[PDB]
Design a binder for these strands. Sequence first.
DNA 1: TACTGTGGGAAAGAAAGTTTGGAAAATTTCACACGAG
DNA 2: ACTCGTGTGAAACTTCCCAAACTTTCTTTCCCACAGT
Lengths: 55, 55, 423, 423, 196, 196
Amino acid sequence: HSAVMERLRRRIELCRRHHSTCEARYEAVSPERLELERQHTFALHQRCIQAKAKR
Amino acid sequence: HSAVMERLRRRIELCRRHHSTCEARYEAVSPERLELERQHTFALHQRCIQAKAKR
Amino acid sequence: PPPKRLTREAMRNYLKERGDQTVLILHAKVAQKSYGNEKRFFCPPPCVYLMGSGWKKKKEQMERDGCSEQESQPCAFIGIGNSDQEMQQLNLEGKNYCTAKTLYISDSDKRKHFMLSVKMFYGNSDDIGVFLSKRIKVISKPSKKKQSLKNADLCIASGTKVALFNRLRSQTVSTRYLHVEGGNFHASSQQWGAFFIHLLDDDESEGEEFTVRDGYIHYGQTVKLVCSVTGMALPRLIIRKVDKQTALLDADDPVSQLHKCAFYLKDTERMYLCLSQERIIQFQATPCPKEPNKEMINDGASWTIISTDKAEYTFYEGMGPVLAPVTPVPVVESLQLNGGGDVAMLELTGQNFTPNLRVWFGDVEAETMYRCGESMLCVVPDISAFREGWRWVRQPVQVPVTLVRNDGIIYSTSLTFTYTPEP
Amino acid sequence: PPPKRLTREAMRNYLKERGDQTVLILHAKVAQKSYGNEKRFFCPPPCVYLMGSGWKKKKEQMERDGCSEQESQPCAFIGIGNSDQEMQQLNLEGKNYCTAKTLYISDSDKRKHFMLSVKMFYGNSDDIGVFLSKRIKVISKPSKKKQSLKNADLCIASGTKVALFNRLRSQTVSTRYLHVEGGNFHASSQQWGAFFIHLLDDDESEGEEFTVRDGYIHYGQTVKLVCSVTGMALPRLIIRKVDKQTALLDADDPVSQLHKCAFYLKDTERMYLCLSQERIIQFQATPCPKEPNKEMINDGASWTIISTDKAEYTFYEGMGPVLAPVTPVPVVESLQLNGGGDVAMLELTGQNFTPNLRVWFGDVEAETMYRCGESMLCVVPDISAFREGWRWVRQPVQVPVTLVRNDGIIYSTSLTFTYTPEP
Amino acid sequence: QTDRTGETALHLAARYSRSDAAKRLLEASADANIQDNMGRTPLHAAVSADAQGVFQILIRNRATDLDARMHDGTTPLILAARLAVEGMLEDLINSHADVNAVDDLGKSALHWAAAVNNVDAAVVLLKNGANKDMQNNREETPLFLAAREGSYETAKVLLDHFANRDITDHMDRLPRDIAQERMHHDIVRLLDEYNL
Amino acid sequence: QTDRTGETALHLAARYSRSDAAKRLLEASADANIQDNMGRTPLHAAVSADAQGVFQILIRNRATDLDARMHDGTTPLILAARLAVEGMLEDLINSHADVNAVDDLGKSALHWAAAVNNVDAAVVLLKNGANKDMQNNREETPLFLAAREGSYETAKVLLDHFANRDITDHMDRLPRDIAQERMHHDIVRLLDEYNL
DNA sequence: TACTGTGGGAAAGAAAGTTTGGAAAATTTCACACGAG
DNA sequence: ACTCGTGTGAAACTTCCCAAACTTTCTTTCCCACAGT
């Protein structure tokens, strides 16, 4: 131990830390990112509904 | 030992045996071989001796 | 309503239900370019199925809240993406599948490859997100190429699923594809099945015990085809090339993509497999007098053959409605075991991963490190998370591994970690 | 009288005497071809010396048996070997050295390399055997080649001994070579010395403390030359090319074999080293008006330069007369220590080995395995062969190694095995 | 083969980090390039298991294929790069592993290292040949994967060795674009304005 | 360097056949390609000393230059061939030593093996590439050295893989000739009449 | 004289090269004519 | 042509595999003036 244990603590931290920075950009941008997905699912729904009006 | 010793006995024997077969051909041929060396040192000595006769 | 991380509970009541929603795009591996004003359509048409005993549950739950027959209507649109053409709707009404038989690719699309994106939402504007097809390759014209396997991507290899279609005399509307209706092979102009193109031996034993081979497929070989759809198989056939409705018996080159051909039923006289202006039968093939080994053949025994692909995506709602699209959907190619026992972890390689997931071993959530898009890592939880006794793995236990998002959408995997006693 | 293997005794009375006979052929590394009826002579002439305070011992012992002043006359013949030209005698009378200044090589000698063989016997027909020169290379013409070191064999490298000669206006008879008479450099038409061509630094300190460099030698460099013969050295010179008795200062190419040149004495005005129609001096060199850095120069400061070689061979009679030639003579390039202590052997690499030798460590003959011509092997005899006390090598002992024939001719080596306490 | 996983006695000691257990198995002329059902040599196991002990053994041993691939064609140099272990990457490089070797998706350890924003790996890899502009069977420059995953630091580093930022994917999207899209404005700003 | 012979701690254990003494000196990241004043790496020493123990270690180790030369440019593959040891030649071959590597006199182990009539060596060497008609800086085919030394058995073997019997030396003497001369009438009879 | 070496040059050659043509599959793209609404 | 998927197949075109003088730095040959026998 502590030979390896300090090495393993250090490795795991790297992943841990990384994963952190990732799962936190993704969450942060997602509002703004869902936004060319809404505005799109919109003026495209007004076509889903008038081809239902042709049956 | 006998692990290595039997191996070393076997190696040395190779050189030994070889050396033998060599030093035995060389000796055997050397008569016949010294013979284009005598016959040559001869009719060449009858030239070493008549340029001594010109001094 | 704020997002609810799935719970130890919600889960155990999915390993019982298994009430999966699931998309499932089928589609051709290649698509012919369309120079200038013209319009070459994707000649098997990209076919958006929609399996899974839980699309129903989503119609049920929805209406039981105050929702139209119009509202709980899944509403799909396809598209090559990156265009001013906009998208094209799909009629998912009535039947659950659908096909987009007027899709093309301009001369003004420089991209030497492309992808089909299947946008979707419920009528209520309630979103469900974009789905993606498994990579498609532009070509300029079916490439008739002799034995240099240089491009390789174009050569139909063994084992691959392929769909073959029949169109006649050169008219757009006739198009009919070898499909299976319940168990009886026909030629729909709506439905196309995908068959595996397994390779076989030149010298033959009986018509069963089917033992397969490696390498690419060359004209003249013997090839059985099993449908993934009905499971059924056609008798042992022999693929041969075709030029002006004549089936040249001695074609020694490898089957390239989008190539015309014909299927000689082995040991049936000179009979072949042929398109019926109805339900599918066999045909004798005309004489062969001036050209010796080159048989003349029917309009209907002349098929076009293309290698295909599927793009599956399962996903369950484990915490009811979620505001944002359930997409991108995690798919998991491989599961690697890093390390051992008390340090044991697991690496997951797949694609579309996202930091906001967490791999669950059965009902126990395990800490999850996200390395990137196509790799993830998690810590094999202790055996005493399942069998509460034991400090050690005293004998084999197998739980199913699965990805779970934040707002508890749960993407299934059919992969299973198996604890094992130490060797 | 039957052949007598050398004895523990004969030996110890050679490590006191050391009364060695020794041949010693000097000679150039290249020889110009001689097309058709012509006859280009070897322009430093191969020069068969004959050192060793033991040739005398052989005149003494011989006559003291009933032998003429005519009989104890070493009688040598040289030759390129492989010819119908037969051989050419050398006059070893009076002085002990000799030179063969009319040796050539026909157009009818296809061999792109060759060797000088110096046959020898005492007047009485009593044989002494053939001696060989160290490989010589035919060329077609002195090759004036710019900086591509492709042949490399032709380029005069640093450190190599070279002899340089002066011939004038194009006449055979004038030929005079830089030789050393006792300590005063001259130009004999009988004697030629061999000097080492060490390389130096462009920027200079004092005229001593001579520190050498690597690589080939290019015109323009500074080069001191030390004679192996007297030990003496000439002042720091600068080698430059020569075309029509003009010494081009800016020659950046490497000195090729048999090239005309001149030696600028560093820091002496415009003085060079020049041939004296007498004893050797320096010369100012003419003007240089139309050609700027190109000085005009004398007949006598224009030397031809050739890389040389020696072929030594020592051998003592340790059991008196032997009927057969003392030849081939074992020469021992390197002495390797295989193994250690109680197993310790020794591998000998040289050339001309023969099964009928046996390497002696001082006075103790050691068992000798002959591997081949250029490799032999013998068993390091126990330390208690020299220091009769001790079972171990208690502290450093050094005996001289030497090769010994059957009929006890003994070929010396000047190489020494050194026992050492184990580490 | 325990036939459960297809793993050998060596494979095990690699994963379990028994550093001298492995040694005797090597005294035994036991083949160190056996494949388990994943198609991995014990070295792959050793790297995966951050087992410096065993690792060091196998790499110091000459028999061992350092560039061995898996069923998905992953080289130890690949895992090394993604699994973020200390040293290994370098030691394999020094022992002369094919630095440009690729997996089935034709991604180099430089690629992966840029996917996992593994700046250290990327730098060592750059200073050891490494096609900085290599593409994968999606025509993806590793500068791309970076700009996708938005791993900015690794990205600055290729922009640093001047990776070509103009090489696109197999759909004619600049890396510059997959940034824009995934909402990494930083990676954008960098691609817009750093070097040239 | 004990500076007596220039030999290292490794060199010694090689020559002295201390097979595990060598092992720890390798646990120590001690360089195993150091040159003594003869210009030989401990491997050379190991071969010279028929020390299978130590030998095996060094060759199983990847760092170790298998084709290292001496001041006279001898490879271990050369010693192996001449010093007539068991196995070693083969083991070096299998570990992928340059079989056609030469010493300063430009003789290959095949050459030497024919010099010391080492039939076994010659066969193994032939079945592993080995230019059978290589020359040395005297234009000597190994068939030649055989015919000189008159080592007949190795000779039959190259005549056996059809070595070119007509390639001469650098003085236009056939091997056929240096036989005649040295009075090996057997090697002659064989060159006159065996194969063609 | 007319034959001895020698230097020396000039026409005869030659094996390590860069590369220029360009002859041999397989792309692009475009311009076009059946058969159908 | 009335306007729009499909297939012809001819004309432009791409890397590509391989066979030529010469770029070309080396030789080897032989052919011939100049000075001493």
